[PDB]
Design a binder for this molecule. Structure first.
Ligand SMILES: Nc1nc2c(ncn2[C@@H]2O[C@H](COP(=O)(O)OP(=O)(O)OP(=O)(O)O)[C@@H](O)[C@H]2O)c(=O)[nH]1
Ligand SMILES: Nc1nc2c(ncn2[C@@H]2O[C@H](COP(=O)(O)OP(=O)(O)O)[C@@H](O)[C@H]2O)c(=O)[nH]1
Ligand SMILES: Nc1nc2c(ncn2[C@@H]2O[C@H](COP(=O)(O)OP(=O)(O)O)[C@@H](O)[C@H]2O)c(=O)[nH]1
Ligand SMILES: [Mg+2]
Lengths: 426, 436, 176, 426
């Protein structure tokens, strides 16, 4: 009933959302043809949080694909589970931003938002009770960083009392795939800090390290990273879809993890990520889940928590557990790592338990931490912004596209005071 | 003790189609017109003789005429599941519709089929020997209901005179209405309902929709759902003339008991318990609770909040096992309540009738079988709201003289337009004057 | 030419009296038991024509009353506190916009003055107001017939009036 | 038992009515051979409105076909379902006129209407109780506009108390097909506003844009451009042929939609309209059908319906539904768009339902709106007419046929006054 509408932006957003819908479709039992082919009754109970009933059991996702080039749209259509989406939702400008933030926020955004906003408004009005919006995008590209944040600002001004949870894959310093990454990322966070509500930070460097060590994968294609991010998404959206001994919806997680309205950049993990040569060896229990949870080498970000104190933490478990066990495990972790937690916040950990674990597994958990260690990820982008702004490199491609010379200074100022406001409460 | 029915217009015919089903089922008559042979339910050798005749060789025929101008509804009935129940001549169908035109339905086309309709009434009433009165079902939101209906009331009052006429008239809902030119027809039919009907039970549509979405829990109702409960109300009103009871109440004192003045006769109707087949057995349904549910403000078949004015005369018909003691206690509590204030000049306000026949049930309905039921017909002073509300949106149209050419092209005049306007003014003024 | 609802009432009542006299003559003729209805239809069509003319006069009167009462509110905005002096200055600017801008040079000058005055606050409305000022300025500088700049001038005047009818911009608008 | 006589004039009238007759004959379930094959019983019950039994099942349609060029009747007789029209109903000349309103309305209007009237009178007196005349034609042609208009005047003089539904296609500004479009349009309007009971005006670029967006056809030919109009013409006559919860005939529609006898130029719609690709992803229900009805890019007239107010509107639904939600949707639309509805009428929208959807579907609707935004479709023609008449261009082809300048002056005056009173009611 309470509603989530899924907007995917850019090439990365399109691919991640495609994999995520592939995952959720099988988690609910839906055939890629579109029909329902599940086993248990309890799957059907909340499929209206993600789907619509078209004509005779044709469950279709409530998603909008948004991008400026049709190549990735064609690839998504070709890929599996492509014939599940509504072709009306497919919106694209066919020209291409070309990793030009100014072009994607001022030039082609002004021409394609007029339709993508219409589509998202249509989905919202087809809804009845809106919990909020789900967004997927990047912070290193023209469409993802510019048009994604423009759409986020549009949504916040239109529906001011609906949350947005947005998965932003950010440019890590040493896995960079382009040269204007800080010029895009800083300008995007300029509006992400004051428009969005939960900017769930991800980066591909941590996913690469995880695939190297924990999964012991040798040649990880983007499919597996997209699978991991989809697993995190499903772990977040599970109390909304299955019953549990405790309830923690999106609004509850936000109100618990955001002490101040500018500290909404959460960093996450997932358990148990087991190499398929050790899955047969390890016996999974709640202590094992919490060990791999608080294991720093499993967090999906390049912000090591040993360097920063934790403001808040949440753990969403899935499986018929023992609530005493879960809570005492949280207490044990809090008492062991007694220096990484804020002193003026007692019991920094909030734990929810749902009764239905993901498909196949018998026990799972998702970690969502709001720590001050994340400010390294912003220092490492502010330094690069200053580096390529000191001698005015690559400015004209944005200056002549519509942007002035003061927005960059404003973005640098907001980076500096944001880092200062994490340092203050560290 | 026989009563005949005349159905005029789409609404009247459809309500009658959803009512005669209930009647035949209640008296056990098979849909083809003859009672079964071995199966025996109740003793009704004259309990059927009110609404039905008996054509000698076991073939009951209802005392009713359906009549329409658009023959679609009439031949739909003629080909429906009740081909044999009706007489093949009590279903009158003209040629062309009246098309939301009171003038066309009352002056041009109406004056060529009422001559047959009332002749059928004459040679139908000659067959009875204890006739009580008529009851009419019509919607004033259209042409056949307003025009032909008003003409038939005129030419039946002039012919049979003293006999009572229980009208069951559908006014338009305040803001929900299919037709658009309907306020004109509403006022034109009012200026004939006021002076030709002894008791006019009003019925609305938003009120019934509200009832069937709050209590009955049907969020997408329809006319097949409205007419069923309207028929329930009719049957609860007229049960006494067919069934003996502890305290029988017949049609004469509905007038000599609920009509304190020659012109103040406008009934709010209510029925309890409007309940589903799930809450039914989980709720303890006794006299006090069903009466309170009848008297709650949002349980009236007409959308008006009966807290603005005062109640002039209430009549409560009970079906099923109800003792005099607990109904007396219930009406005592109703008087003690602080929400409703009765008019001053009428200290004793209620009249309670009782009957031993439990409420019937139609297989395929939403109202599950219950032990007892209550139907209230109340003369109140909170109908001035309805009349003034319709008056304002009549005036809005009439200022620009919009749509008036469709009327003057058939025979209306702005003279009688203003006449009906001032008639509504006089009626609401009378309500204001009698309330004090 | 009416301006008051009382005068409109007088017109309505005299028209209704005329209708009654016409229909009374038609009835007292007592003839044409089949052309009576045709005469009635023609009389109603006449009534419709006259009512539509009354509607047109009502539209004109409503527009002129609106303009006159805006001017009256501007006057009541004047009848020597500093806020009231600024109100008088803004009234002067509004009258400059109201008067027939027959000269392109004076048009540009008054647009320049109002743009200077408006550009002081700059919260949300000045964006569109300045956009419209620049639109008129460019379409006059490049050279286009001012008779074709009618709706745009109307829009500038409307936005300027909305700007004046604002507390912060005119620090006495709490009055009305 | 109510009888509609269907006349079709000109090339437009011939093709449109041929499509209409194929659709209606198929829906009542008769094969092109001429026999009956409707399985149900609801179909035989009202064949008499459009068909007459000749001898042994040969249900000949009741229709009149009239123009001046043999090619149109040749094509109609050749085309599918064209083997059923009675040959004696091919009342017809020999020459052809072409784009000349004066030639088709003065010369051939003498030696052809003298027989067209005979055929119409015979066909009308053949049936028992007439309901009205349904005539389809164009305004920018010579053999359909002038000839059809003179037929309209003659039949209004003959039968005064009969409904008249003129399905007239009007010339387009952008879609240039001939140069005498303003002349013919003004001349035809000058008599339609005087005699026609109501004109369900249509055009071509609105239908082309409909076939582009709402159906995504790539090469929309006349074979479907007229199929849409055929569907509308079939859907308007639903009560006279099928039962329902709330019947409503042509007289009812006129009463509910004509506040004054010079306000009878309706713009028309039809729902649902969806592409064959997405006919599987949309839900068929009144909430979506009503939104599709109340749209600007869904109407079949090049008048943006928001450019003014709606004096009145009507909705005709087909299919099992809930007359609670139908009325609720109509009232919701009124309350939401109260700005675009005239004030001095409450409940500007009439809504009538029926229990029979069209064949090959399960639910349908039809929209008929008398709005003041239809003034522009006449303003453009009026301004073109003024521009052309200031120069007397192409005038000799009328003046040497018999028409004078007084006809043009009168047509312009009536056009201007009706447009002015549309502007008044706004
Ligand atoms: N409650 C209820 N109202 C109905 C029903 N059937 C029709 N109506 C009402 O009837 C009105 C239609 O106008 P009518 O007076 O019935 O017109 P008609 O009987 O079709 O005759 P014409 O006016 O000539 O078409 C609608 O506004 C409905 O409110 C019904 O089954 N239940
Ligand atoms: N997780 C994941 N990341 C991807 C994938 N493809 C690209 N990326 C990341 O996205 C970044 C480039 O974003 P880009 O596609 O240019 O954004 P756009 O310009 O809006 O389309 C690179 O740094 C990649 O690391 C994918 O399939 N999965
Ligand atoms: N939609 C549609 N429009 C047509 C068709 N045939 C002609 N037209 C349009 O009708 C207008 C004039 O019709 P016209 O050919 O003169 O009719 P005629 O008098 O019979 O020749 C032209 O602008 C054409 O574009 C058709 O089959 N369908
Ligand atoms: Mg009717």
């Amino acid at each position: 009933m309470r509603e989530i509408v899924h907007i995917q932006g850019g090439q990365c957003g399109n691919q991640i959302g495609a994999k995520f819908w592939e995952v959720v479709s099988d988690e609910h039992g839906i055939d890629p043809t579109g029909t329902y082919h599940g086993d248990s009754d309890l799957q059907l109970e909340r499929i209206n949080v993600y789907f619509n009933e078209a004509t005779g059991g044709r469950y279709v996702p409530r998603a909008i694909l948004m991008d400026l080039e049709p190549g990735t749209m064609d690839s998504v259509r070709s890929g599996p589970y492509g014939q599940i989406f509504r072709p009306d939702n497919f919106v694209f400008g066919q020209t291409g931003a070309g990793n030009n933030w100014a072009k994607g926020h001022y030039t082609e955004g002004a021409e394609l938002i007029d339709s993508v906003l219409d589509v998202v408004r249509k989905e919202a009005e087809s809804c009845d009770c809106l919990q909020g919006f789900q967004v997927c995008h990047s912070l290193g590209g023209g469409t993802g960083s510019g048009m994604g944040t423009l759409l986020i600002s549009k949504i916040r001004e239109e529906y001011p009392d609906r949350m947005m949870l947005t998965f932003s894959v950010v440019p890590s310093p040493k896995v960079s795939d382009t040269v204007v990454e800080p010029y895009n990322a800083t300008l995007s966070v300029h509006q992400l800090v004051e428009n969005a509500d939960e900017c769930m930070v991800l980066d591909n460097e941590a996913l690469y390290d995880i695939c190297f060590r924990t999964l012991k994968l040798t040649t990880p294609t983007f499919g597996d990273l997209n699978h991991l991010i989809s697993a995190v998404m499903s772990g977040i959206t599970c109390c909304l879809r299955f019953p549990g001994q405790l309830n923690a919806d999106l609004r509850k997680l936000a109100v618990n993890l955001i002490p101040f309205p500018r500290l909404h950049f959460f960093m996450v993990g997932f358990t148990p990520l087991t190499s398929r040569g050790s899955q047969q060896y390890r016996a999974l229990t709640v202590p094992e889940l919490t060990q791999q949870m608080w294991d720093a080498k499993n967090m999906m970000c390049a912000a090591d928590p040993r360097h920063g104190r934790y403001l808040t933490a949440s753990a969403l478990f899935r499986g018929r557990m023992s609530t005493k066990e879960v809570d005492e495990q949280m207490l044990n972790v809090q008492n062991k790592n007694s220096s990484y937690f804020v002193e003026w916040i007692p019991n920094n950990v909030k734990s929810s338990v749902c009764d239905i674990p993901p498909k196949g597994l018998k026990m799972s958990a998702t970690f969502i931490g709001n720590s001050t260690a994340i400010q390294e990820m912003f220092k490492r982008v502010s330094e690069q912004f200053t580096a390529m702004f000191r001698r005015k490199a690559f400015l004209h491609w944005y200056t002549g596209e519509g942007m002035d010379e003061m927005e960059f200074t404003e973005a640098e100022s907001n980076m500096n005071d944001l880092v200062s406001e994490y340092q203050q409460y560290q | 003790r026989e009563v005949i029915s005349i159905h005029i217009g789409q609404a009247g015919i459809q309500v009658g189609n959803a009512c005669w089903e209930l009647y035949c089922l209640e008296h056990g008559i098979q849909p083809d017109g003859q009672m079964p042979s071995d199966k025996t339910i109740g003793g009704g050798d004259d309990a059927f003789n009110t609404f039905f005749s008996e054509t000698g060789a076991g073939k009951h025929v209802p005392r009713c005429i359906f009549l329409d101008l658009e023959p679609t509804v009439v031949d739909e009935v003629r080909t429906g599941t009740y081909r044999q129940l009706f007489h093949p001549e009590q279903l009158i169908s003209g040629k062309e519709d009246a098309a939301n035109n009171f003038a066309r339905g009352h002056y041009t086309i109406g004056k060529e089929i009422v001559d047959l309709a009332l002749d059928r009434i004459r040679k139908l009433a000659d067959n009875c020997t204890g006739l009580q009165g008529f009851l009419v079902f019509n919607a004033v939101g259209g042409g056949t209901g307003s025009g032909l209906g008003s003409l038939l009331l005129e030419r039946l009052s002039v012919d049979y005179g003293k006999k009572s006429k229980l009208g069951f008239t559908v006014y338009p809902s305040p803001q929900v209405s299919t037709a658009v030119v309907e306020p004109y027809n509403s006022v034109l039919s009012t200026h004939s309902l006021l002076e030709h009907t002894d008791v006019a039970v009003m019925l609305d549509n938003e009120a019934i929709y509200d009832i069937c979405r709050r209590s009955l829990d049907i969020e997408r109702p329809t006319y097949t759902n409205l007419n069923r409960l309207i028929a329930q109300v009719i049957s609860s009103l007229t049960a006494s003339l067919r069934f003996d009871g502890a305290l029988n109440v017949d049609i004469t004192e509905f007038q000599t008991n609920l009509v304190p003045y020659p012109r103040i006769h406008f009934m709010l109707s209510s029925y309890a318990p409007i309940i589903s087949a799930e809450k039914a057995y989980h709720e303890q349904l006794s006299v006090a609770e069903i009466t309170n549910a009848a008297f709650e403000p949002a349980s009236m078949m007409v959308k008006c909040d009966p807290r603005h004015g005062k109640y002039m005369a209430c009549c409560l018909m009970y079906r099923g096992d109800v003792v005099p003691k607990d109904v007396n206690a219930s009406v005592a509590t109703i008087k003690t309540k602080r929400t409703i204030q009765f008019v001053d000049w009428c200290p004793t306000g209620f009249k309670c009738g009782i009957n031993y026949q439990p409420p019937t049930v139609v297989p395929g309905g939403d109202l599950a079988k219950v032990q007892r039921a209550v139907c209230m017909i109340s003369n109140s002073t909170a109908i001035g709201e309805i009349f003034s509300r319709l008056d304002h949106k009549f005036d809005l149209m009439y200022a620009k003289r919009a749509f008036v050419h469709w009327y003057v092209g058939e025979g209306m005049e702005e003279g009688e337009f203003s006449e009906a306007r001032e008639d509504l003014a006089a009626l609401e003024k009378d309500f204001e004057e009698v309330g004090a | 030419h009416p301006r008051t609802a009382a005068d409109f009432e007088v017109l309505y009542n005299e028209l209704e009296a005329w209708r009654l006299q016409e229909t009374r003559k038609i009835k007292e003729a007592g003839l044409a038991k089949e052309q009576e209805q045709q005469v009635l239809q023609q009389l109603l069509h006449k009534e419709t024509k006259l009512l539509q003319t009354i509607d047109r006069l009502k539209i004109n009167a409503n527009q002129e009353n609106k303009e006159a009462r805006i001017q009256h509110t501007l006057n009541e905005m004047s009848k020597h506190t500093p806020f009231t002096t600024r109100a008088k200055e803004l009234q002067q600017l509004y009258n400059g916009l109201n008067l027939p801008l027959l000269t392109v040079d004076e048009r540009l000058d008054v647009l320049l003055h109002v743009k200077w005055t408006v550009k002081e606050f700059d919260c949300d409305l000045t964006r569109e107001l300045v956009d419209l000022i620049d639109r008129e300025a460019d379409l006059l500088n490049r050279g286009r017939n001012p008779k074709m700049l009618e709706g745009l001038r109307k829009r500038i005047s409307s936005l300027f009036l909305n700007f004046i009818e604002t507390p912060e911009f005119n620090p006495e608008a709490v009055r009305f």
